[PDB]
Write a protein that binds this ligand. Structure first.
Ligand SMILES: Cc1cnc(C)n2nc(CCc3nc(N4CCCC4=O)cn3C)nc12
Ligand SMILES: [Mg+2]
Ligand SMILES: [Zn+2]
Length: 312
């Protein structure tokens, strides 16, 4: 049958956590199919249905600076690297669900936070009072699965299908960073007191939630030039929301105020110390082969430190 194969450099480097999917948009679908075939099997999905699903997902990502189709595919590649370094830890349905969840997790993102939607009084803030954009992304995922010729899960039973969509729903909701802090603290306590139990469904749920955060934040785990240039896209969004906050007559938080361009290096320090390092530290304790993510994050923290010291 029909393998996808990549050029030699991509074939080797796609296996590493720090892989950058490159600036050729037209190769990203092929890169995703390649990752599904190796992490799931050539039998998981009918190629035609999967190709049609990938292309409708791409179409429902918007042309925003950071929360775009490249982000979707980047977050899927980090999940692929986690899954490939932990062969035997995950069920068949989890392998199927989690790459889809990653591809779908920011579907139809508009470049604005949950907080901006509530202050603007967007209709989505009335339909979904918490994790507003994340419930929207899961709703968009179901919509696309229900288009003609797009049911990639069509060969699962009613109960397997229900389990896979429930894995995807939880994985997507878990990308609401507001929920990460409490999830990581619970996992930290569980790991240390030795209660962490991977046969406990509500435990696996938490561990998959942390994987989702780790993949979502994975720009901090890349080579420094990738990390630094991705940060510019992240801030281009934040500062546009800042502008929109000022139009509602609301002072944005410093994170979203382009007037504080200069403090970006110190903003990154707080974010590595408060968010990223704790995330990859707890993930590495639970899933030891994800250490390369923690090591790369620590490398990038030390680069932001060099920027503050004026050494870069
Ligand atoms: C969600 C996400 C994901 N990946 C990355 C790399 N980032 N970087 C961020 C912003 C960090 C941050 N910057 C500030 N700034 C900047 C100057 C004033 C200020 O306060 C505050 N904070 C918390 N957010 C993320
Ligand atoms: Mg999101
Ligand atoms: Zn995301």
């Amino acid at each position: 049958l029909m393998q996808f194969t990549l050029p030699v450099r991509l074939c080797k480097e796609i296996e590493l956590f720090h892989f950058d999917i490159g600036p050729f948009e037209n190769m990203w679908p092929g890169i995703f199919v390649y990752m599904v075939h190796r992490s799931c099997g050539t039998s998981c999905f009918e190629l035609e249905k999967l190709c049609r699903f990938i292309m409708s997902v791409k179409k429902n990502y918007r042309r925003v600076p950071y929360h775009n189709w490249k982000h979707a595919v980047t977050v899927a590649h980090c999940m692929y690297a986690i899954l490939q370094n932990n062969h035997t830890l995950f069920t068949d349905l989890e392998r199927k669900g989690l790459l889809i969840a990653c591809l779908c997790h920011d579907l139809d993102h508009r470049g604005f936070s949950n907080s901006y939607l509530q202050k603007f009084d967007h209709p989505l803030a009335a339909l979904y009072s918490t994790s507003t954009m994340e419930q929207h992304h899961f709703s968009q995922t179901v919509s696309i699965l229900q288009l003609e010729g797009h049911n990639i899960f069509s060969t699962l039973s009613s109960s397997e299908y229900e389990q896979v969509l429930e894995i995807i729903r939880k994985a997507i909701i878990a990308t609401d960073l507001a929920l990460y802090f409490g999830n990581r603290k619970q996992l930290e306590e569980m790991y240390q007191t030795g209660s962490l139990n991977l046969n406990n469904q509500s435990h696996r749920d938490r561990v998959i939630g942390l994987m989702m955060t780790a993949c979502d934040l994975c720009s901090v785990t890349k080579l420094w030039p990738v990390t630094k240039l991705t940060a510019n896209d992240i801030y281009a969004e934040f500062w546009a929301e800042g502008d929109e906050m000022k139009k509602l007559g609301i002072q944005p938080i410093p994170m979203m105020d382009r007037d504080k361009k200069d403090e970006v290096p110190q903003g990154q320090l707080g974010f590595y110390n408060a968010v990223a390092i704790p995330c990859y530290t707890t993930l590495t304790q639970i899933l030891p082969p994800t250490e390369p993510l923690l090591k790369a994050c620590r490398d990038n923290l030390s680069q932001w430190e060099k920027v503050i010291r004026g050494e870069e």
